[PDB]
RNA sequence: UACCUGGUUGAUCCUGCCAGUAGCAUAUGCUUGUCUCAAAGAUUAAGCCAUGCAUGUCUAAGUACGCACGGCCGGUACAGUGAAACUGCGAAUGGCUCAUUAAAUCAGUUAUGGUUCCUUUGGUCGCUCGCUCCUCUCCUACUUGGAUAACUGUGGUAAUUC
RNA sequence: CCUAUCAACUUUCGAUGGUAGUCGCCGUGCCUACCAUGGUGACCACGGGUGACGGGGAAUCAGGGUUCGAUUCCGGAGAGGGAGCCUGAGAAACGGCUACCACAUCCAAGGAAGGCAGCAGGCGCGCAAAUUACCCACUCCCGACCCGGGGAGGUAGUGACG
RNA sequence: GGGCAAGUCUGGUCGCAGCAGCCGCGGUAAUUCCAGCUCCAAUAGCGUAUAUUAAAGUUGCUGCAGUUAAAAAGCUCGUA
């Protein structure tokens, strides 16, 4: 309600091929209408199919009233997927990170040490221990 | 045990003229080795995402360097932290924007769009003129660009309009009295103006008495004096903060002005 | 990384004349404890000595002027000092209570829905007011000149205009369940 | 504990085994691991004697001479293929390479030959016309930049060296008056 | 905040310390509702350390003969991709800790015209200026030689990154 | 920093100077050949004492002054203690090695494999100190390198330090 | 109990138990106990321990004292 995305400091990021601006939305008494709404709202502002609009920010101002977000209207998803921090991909989930998680990969580094050749045997050397 | 040189560099114990923050990021960009000494140097990533702010994360700036959109000294850069020193143009190859690295009299790097006429040449006050082996004279400037066959009338501290397209030096400007010199370092950083005086001592430690454009006359050594051309003859544009000298009671009259006066 | 105390401790532990004098400023302005006395007491000793040192500086010093004219302006932007006097001799003559009047609490007691300075601290603490587009919850807020021109009902105070929380509803439930018999 | 080139006599010893001695499988640059090593000569102590029939006999061991354990990797160099036939090197490998039919490696067979190194191709002929291009370019670019200064040097002298004749004549006037 | 307060004595004036008196920063006694900040195995053990993990890395560009994967597309070496492996580089730094050292560290200032430096920035790469042409017969330039890893199997090994 | 209930010290072992060369990244009694008897102290040297890492800086005091710097920084020093080698530009590397010396493991008795003052965590000591946490995203780092890896670090936890 | 703010309370205790940094209570009509109550103090802190800084001009550089309270050598020359 009474949202009004105020694109402060608009930056035509030509070398990252995107529309880059600060999202500043207003509220009656409940801050932060949802992010993908703001994407879809910043879509129809720019007519840009908002699944290339990879937003973040969105902290709720005290007293409702306002929320500062941030917008990157990438001019393509290739313009998105070229720049794209993975936690912006995980800001609204359409790509996520590694879930080995992190200790088996550190364990596999202990496996290539022991024999020369056949990483499959060393992947297999890390495969049998699961403790 | 200092068993080799440090291959890491953290923040705030970092140069202040890079205008980094406090411990918000616990590591520094750490510029590479190259043409200039490391404190003179400026990382691209500070100029890219902390001065122009087209990026926000480091792996983008790696890919922006994989975009190869950055030409420093007219030469293709894929370094996020290239050791670029003084009067180094930066050609942002996608926005069509040239910026030459010069210092302010406030004490900050100037995001300074020179004309592309002024981007082909940069003025390097020379570092040495040496008769190399087999009887061959040379000039090598402060960015260590070893150039065979100098000019046959130049001497020390002459400024060469370094052709950034080629190297392979173009015309010079002789080290002359009263030249415009962006005085850099100490309490005289970023000050341009005529020379009007130089003092000599055998051994070391020669001071140079410089009277700038505002009338501040000051004796500051020739190490602080980088000649940028001819007296009352600039060769790029003047940076922000007038590039000469500013007083702080006037600076509040500056800082009150364009905030809430724009848009 | 860096922190500091915002209150102060005198070198005399029991100076009962002072101890009941500190009871006055709490009762005269609506304070929490003697810390709210000692908070402005922590500041005002530095303010007079900063006024003292700039007075003992030689004139036409920018560290006397540009710092001081800021310190002149900083004391006048909040409206505690007036710049019609505007010299270091009078800044030696300011007090605690000039700041206490420029707190948010007394200005609510001076202006608005406060009947008491018990009441005036409550209206900030129970967030009935907006000093800007700002639910402001700090009674020791010390205000500026423009700040005294936008203190309203909050839009989270459902009386005097606001979205209902659960209380005017409860006060409606005092007539719709307190009087509705269920 | 194995046997190597010079563990001399049969008694099991231990040597500071660096990279460059056998009976040793190294683990780090700059690491010299002293390990136990059994003597090059044989008393009785071994579990395995590594032996090689360099010349067979007349009645076959089935496991060694009737059995065949061949191997598959062929020459990835050019001239090994050529020399056995007394065949020349300007007249190339000229297919005899051991291309390896490797079936169901997708769903087809590949037939993969070792991509021969030390082999001049038309790409190498492109690069031989690219390498000493740059070397001959370097001799001329050295020669170009020399002649640019030499004209620039001598034309400056006609203002500089002419001052010498201006000072010899007034030297004799300064000796006069 | 430039302060003192109590205590000698029959009373008094001293000297004069005592003890009260505030700062602190750990240890702690007791108690604690929100919300912002956060020091924390230094003291004592620079003690031993269990365990978890703390420097990896392939570019269109070193070598694809992966037993791989994917294809007819194959031959001159051919694979799209590519584990490995050999090769290129870091691994010295980082973190941690201050035991140590009393002009020693360190700090400020200087100098290497005594010294060495990966990397990067820039020049330098036809030649023997022809042995007064082996470099025209020295005829290997369309390119050299052999020699290993991965691969394989034989394996031995209480145990081993054997 | 402390000490004269430390007044003289330094070389038989070069202590100090030269010359000469050796060697070392190189200056150098570096080193010896050789020569000289130097060199230096009451201005407290020489020596001994200091949890003496030092400093950037820190707390307090009207001022004058007084206490701190293991401690988010800089520089130094060690990774159990020494020694010796190695690698590379840079390491006597203890997340190298070699051996020793003091510790710790498997042992099937042959041998094999080990040093958290890395993150933690553990015990130990104490008055006294938290995850055996999560993530390589942020920060950076190394690479052949955008790619990756990282207990660096980030992240929260612990957490009336404050 | 004073210093030290606020109990010449109420009860008990009776030089006991305790308290009390110090000065001090308690030996029966306890303002020092032990409690009640009341009050004061600060306050999500407050109190203790130890440490150190001031107060302390009791280390006195500013700026100590040396006839009799501490402190002019037995006296003189006399170098640093």
From Swiss-Prot, chain A:
GO cellular component: cytoplasm; cytosol; cytosolic ribosome; cytosolic small ribosomal subunit; endoplasmic reticulum; membrane; nucleolus; nucleoplasm
Modified residues (Phosphothreonine): 7
This protein's record includes keyword Acetylation: yes
GO BP term, pick one: ribosomal small subunit biogenesis
Tissue specificity annotation: Mature tissues, such as adult brain, skeletal muscle, heart, and kidney, express low levels, whereas tissues and organs with significant populations of proliferating cells, such as fetal brain, placenta, bone marrow, and various glandular organs, contain significantly higher levels.
Entry function: Component of the small ribosomal subunit. The ribosome is a large ribonucleoprotein complex responsible for the synthesis of proteins in the cell. Required for processing of pre-rRNA and maturation of 40S ribosomal subunits. Part of the small subunit (SSU) processome, first precursor of the small eukaryotic ribosomal subunit.
Protein name: Small ribosomal subunit protein eS24
Organism: Homo sapiens
Curated annotation (Swiss-Prot), chain B:
The protein's assembly and partners: Component of the small ribosomal subunit. Part of the small subunit (SSU) processome, composed of more than 70 proteins and the RNA chaperone small nucleolar RNA (snoRNA) U3. Identified in a IGF2BP1-dependent mRNP granule complex containing untranslated mRNAs.
Family: Belongs to the eukaryotic ribosomal protein eS4 family.
The protein's role, per its UniProt record: Component of the small ribosomal subunit. The ribosome is a large ribonucleoprotein complex responsible for the synthesis of proteins in the cell. Part of the small subunit (SSU) processome, first precursor of the small eukaryotic ribosomal subunit. During the assembly of the SSU processome in the nucleolus, many ribosome biogenesis factors, an RNA chaperone and ribosomal proteins associate with the nascent pre-rRNA and work in concert to generate RNA folding, modifications, rearrangements and cleavage as well as targeted degradation of pre-ribosomal RNA by the RNA exosome.
Alphabetical keyword list: Acetylation, Cytoplasm, Isopeptide bond, Nucleus, Ribonucleoprotein, Ribosomal protein, RNA-binding, rRNA-binding, Ubl conjugation
GO cellular component, one term: extracellular exosome
Cross-link (Glycyl lysine isopeptide (Lys-Gly) (interchain with G-Cter in SUMO2)): 230
Principal subcellular localisation of the protein: cytoplasm
Alphabetical GO biological process terms: cytoplasmic translation; positive regulation of cell population proliferation; positive regulation of translation; ribosomal small subunit biogenesis; translation
Source organism of this protein record: Homo sapiens
Keyword field contains Transport: no
Entry keyword annotation includes Isomerase: no
Swiss-Prot record, chain C:
Molecular function via GO: RNA binding; rRNA binding; structural constituent of ribosome; translation regulator activity
TM regions (residue ranges): none
Residue list for modification N6-acetyllysine: 60, 110, 149
Protein name from the UniProt record: Small ribosomal subunit protein uS4
A single GO cellular-component term on record: membrane
InterPro entries: Ribosomal_uS4, Ribosomal_uS4_CS, Ribosomal_uS4_euk/arc, Ribosomal_uS4_N, S4_RNA-bd, S4_RNA-bd_sf
Entries under SMART domains matching the protein: Ribosomal_S4 (SM01390), S4 (SM00363)
Database matches in NCBIfam families: PRK04051.1, uS4_arch
Keyword Ubl conjugation: yes
Cross-link Glycyl lysine isopeptide (Lys-Gly) (interchain with G-Cter in SUMO2): residue positions: 87, 133
Subcellular localization(s) per the UniProt record: Cytoplasm; Nucleus, Nucleolus
Assembly behavior: Component of the small ribosomal subunit. Identified in a IGF2BP1-dependent mRNP granule complex containing untranslated mRNAs. Part of the small subunit (SSU) processome, composed of more than 70 proteins and the RNA chaperone small nucleolar RNA (snoRNA) U3.
CDD domains in the cross-refs: S4 (cd00165)
Major localization class: cytoplasm
Functional note: Component of the small ribosomal subunit. The ribosome is a large ribonucleoprotein complex responsible for the synthesis of proteins in the cell. Part of the small subunit (SSU) processome, first precursor of the small eukaryotic ribosomal subunit. During the assembly of the SSU processome in the nucleolus, many ribosome biogenesis factors, an RNA chaperone and ribosomal proteins associate with the nascent pre-rRNA and work in concert to generate RNA folding, modifications, rearrangements and cleavage as well as targeted degradation of pre-ribosomal RNA by the RNA exosome.
Domain of life where this protein originates: Eukaryota
One BP term from GO: ribosomal small subunit biogenesis
Keyword set includes rRNA-binding: yes
From Swiss-Prot, chain D:
GO MF term list: mRNA binding; protein kinase binding; RNA binding; structural constituent of ribosome
Keywords linked to the UniProt accession: Acetylation, ADP-ribosylation, Cytoplasm, Hydroxylation, Isopeptide bond, Nucleus, Phosphoprotein, Ribonucleoprotein, Ribosomal protein, Ubl conjugation
Segments of this protein annotated with the region Disordered: 157-177
Maturation and modification: Ribosomal protein S6 is the major substrate of protein kinases in eukaryote ribosomes. The phosphorylation is stimulated by growth factors, tumor promoting agents, and mitogens. It is dephosphorylated at growth arrest. Phosphorylated at Ser-175 and Ser-176 by RPS6KA1 and RPS6KA3; phosphorylation at these sites facilitates the assembly of the pre-initiation complex.
Modified residues ((3R)-3-hydroxyarginine): 77
Effect upon mutating residue 77 to X: Abolishes hydroxylation by KDM8
Gene Ontology CC: one annotated term: cytoplasm
Modified residues (Phosphoserine): 88, 175-176
Biased composition (Basic and acidic residues): 157-169
GO biological process assignments: cellular response to ethanol; cytoplasmic translation; glucose homeostasis; negative regulation of bicellular tight junction assembly; positive regulation of apoptotic process; positive regulation of cell population proliferation; response to insulin; ribosomal small subunit assembly
Modified residues annotated as N6-acetyllysine in this record: 151
Cell compartment(s), UniProt: Cytoplasm; Nucleus, Nucleolus
Description of how the protein assembles with itself and partners: Component of the small ribosomal subunit. Part of the small subunit (SSU) processome, composed of more than 70 proteins and the RNA chaperone small nucleolar RNA (snoRNA) U3.
Entry similarity comment: Belongs to the eukaryotic ribosomal protein eS6 family.
Gene name of the encoded protein: RPS6
Full-protein positions shown: 61 to 237 of 249
